[PDB]
C-alpha cells in the first residue's frame, strides 16, 4: 500500500441502499476510528503517512482489501495548501 493508492483510487462498492451491512470488519473499523480521533497529531484527523505508519505493518491480507473502503467510511479526504493529504473524521464518528 502506497499513499497514491489510498488517495487516488475510486470506490468499488455500490450505493449503501443496495448493500447489506456486514460486521466482518467492525473491529478494524473501530481501531481506525479511535486512532484518527485521539492518537494522531491533531484530534479527529490524520495524514496519509500517519495512517500508513500506524497500520501498514499490522494488516492481514483480507484487511488490506477493505482498508481504503473503511477509511472512506470514516473520513473525508483533504489536501492542504502545502499539498499534504489529510483524512478527517466525519461528524457521525466524532
Amino acid at each position: 500500500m502506497l499513499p497514491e493508492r489510498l488517495e487516488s483510487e475510486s470506490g468499488h462498492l455500490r450505493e449503501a441502499s443496495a448493500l447489506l451491512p456486514t460486521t466482518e470488519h467492525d473491529d478494524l473499523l473501530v481501531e481506525m476510528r479511535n486512532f484518527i480521533a485521539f492518537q494522531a497529531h491533531t484530534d479527529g484527523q490524520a495524514s496519509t503517512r500517519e495512517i500508513l505508519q500506524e497500520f501498514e505493518s499490522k494488516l492481514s491480507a483480507s484487511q488490506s482489501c477493505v482498508f481504503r473502503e473503511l477509511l472512506r467510511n470514516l473520513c473525508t479526504f483533504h489536501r492542504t495548501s502545502g499539498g499534504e493529504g489529510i483524512w478527517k473524521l466525519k461528524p457521525e464518528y466524532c
Binding site: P21, T22, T23, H25, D26, D27, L29, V30, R33, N34, A37, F38, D43, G44, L70, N73, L89, E92, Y93, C94
Partner: protein, 74 residues
C-alpha cells in the same frame, strides 16, 4: 434478548435488550454498567454509526449481536 457490547478498553459486556429498544435506551443501559454518560457515547455496528432515534430492530440487530462502543471526541 442478550447482546454483546465491546467497551472502550475492548473487553466485552452483556446487555439484556429488546428489539424495540432505541439506541438511546441501549446507551442508557451501557451507562449503568460502564459509567459513561449517553451524550458521550457512539455505537458502531455493521460498518454504521447507530442513530439514537432508531431501534435495534431497525438495524436488524439480533440475538448475540456485538455492538461497539466508542468515546465521543467533540
Amino acid at each position: 434478548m442478550q447482546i454483546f457490547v465491546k467497551t472502550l478498553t475492548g473487553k466485552t459486556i452483556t446487555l439484556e435488550v429488546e428489539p424495540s429498544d432505541t439506541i438511546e435506551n441501549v446507551k442508557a443501559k451501557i451507562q449503568d454498567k460502564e459509567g459513561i454518560p449517553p451524550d458521550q457515547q457512539r455505537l458502531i455496528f455493521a460498518g454504521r454509526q447507530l442513530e439514537d432515534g432508531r431501534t435495534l430492530s431497525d438495524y436488524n440487530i439480533q440475538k448475540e449481536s456485538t455492538l461497539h462502543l466508542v468515546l465521543r471526541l467533540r
